[PDB]
Amino acid sequence: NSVQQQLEALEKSSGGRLGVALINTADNSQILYRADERFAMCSTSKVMAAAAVLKQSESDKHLLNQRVEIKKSDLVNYNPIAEKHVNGTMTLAELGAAALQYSDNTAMNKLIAHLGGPDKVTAFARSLGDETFRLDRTEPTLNTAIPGDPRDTTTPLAMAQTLKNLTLGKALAETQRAQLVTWLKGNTTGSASIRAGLPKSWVVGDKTGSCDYGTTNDIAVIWPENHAPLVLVTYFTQPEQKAERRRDILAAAAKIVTHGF
Incomplete structure (x- = not known):
């Protein structure tokens, strides 16, 4: 099974909608799955707010x-x-x-x-x-994650591109870029998400998100031991408002797309 077939299979059994965008900075190649579809960001939007303040600084x-x-x-x-x-x-x-x-x-x-x-x-x-x-509301209303609601959303590809620009690219001055990276690496909330599907020794910086409609997200920058960094966004959402979060799905998706690296 190709990576795409594995992702489609993963989604089919998940009971939800999966969004994946992986950027391999070695050659800028990408692995996309519903990467142009909007998903509520939940707390992953915090990265943009913190980065905005870093730009000001x-x-x-x-x-x-x-x-x-x-x-x-x-x-x-x-x-x-x-x-x-x-x-x-x-x-x-x-x-x-x-x-x-x-x-x-x-x-x-x-x-x-x-x-x-x-x-x-x-x-x-x-x-x-x-x-x-697009950020439209403050906490906690930005977490409604109503299907089809454009408020407080973005796409996996858009966020992957921006996260890459912010952490490894042209977006911030060096001291600020390093600060953002330091903050992301020190995250305490992502053990069961993307991190859970990667080799334990890889260095990772990420920001998770969880909100209504069982929306489960995570955006990360990954540093393999002998390879160029990978930028990965895994978004997931469901049809029922009180659906449980599925961090296991994010971990599973991460394992699928980072395979080989």
Whole structure:
């Protein structure tokens, strides 16, 4: 079975819609599956917000350490790090780290507010040549993931291209690029997703996403031991609103497309 046949088979048994985009930076070859179809991003959108702040810091040396007050009213549905700092402050850098490494929703909202709203995050994506990404709402409503709803969505290919540009490409200045990579590598939420389908020794940086309609996502940069990096986006969504997440499917897809590498 070809990789494509394996992916189609994987989806057929999954009970959902699978979206895969892998870019092999060795020759820029790609493995695509519904890569031009939109999927709700869930928390994977946090990468774009954090990157937008990193871009700003390129021209503002005091931005990353700027203090941001955390009030009880700022807390939403999931604030593992922000809740520890109520009544205190967090720097924009710490908010970026919390949003990316723990998927803190309060952190995301602080980043969005700092940037001036969801439309500003979309504007940043467009500045990177990403004409697909769109952020419309804040946390937690950006997680509705209603089938066919274009809000807070992107395509696997668009996100793979942008993630490559951000982490290995032309998008950010070196210090900022390295910071984004450091944050992604330090993610604590992706053990069961893409990481679970790769050789245990490979270095990986990723950002997961999980939301309604059993939407299960993960976008990652992978560094094999003897090969050029791979950029992989695995999105998955289902027809029922309260469907369970299926991180096992993302792991399975990762194993299929990275085979041989």
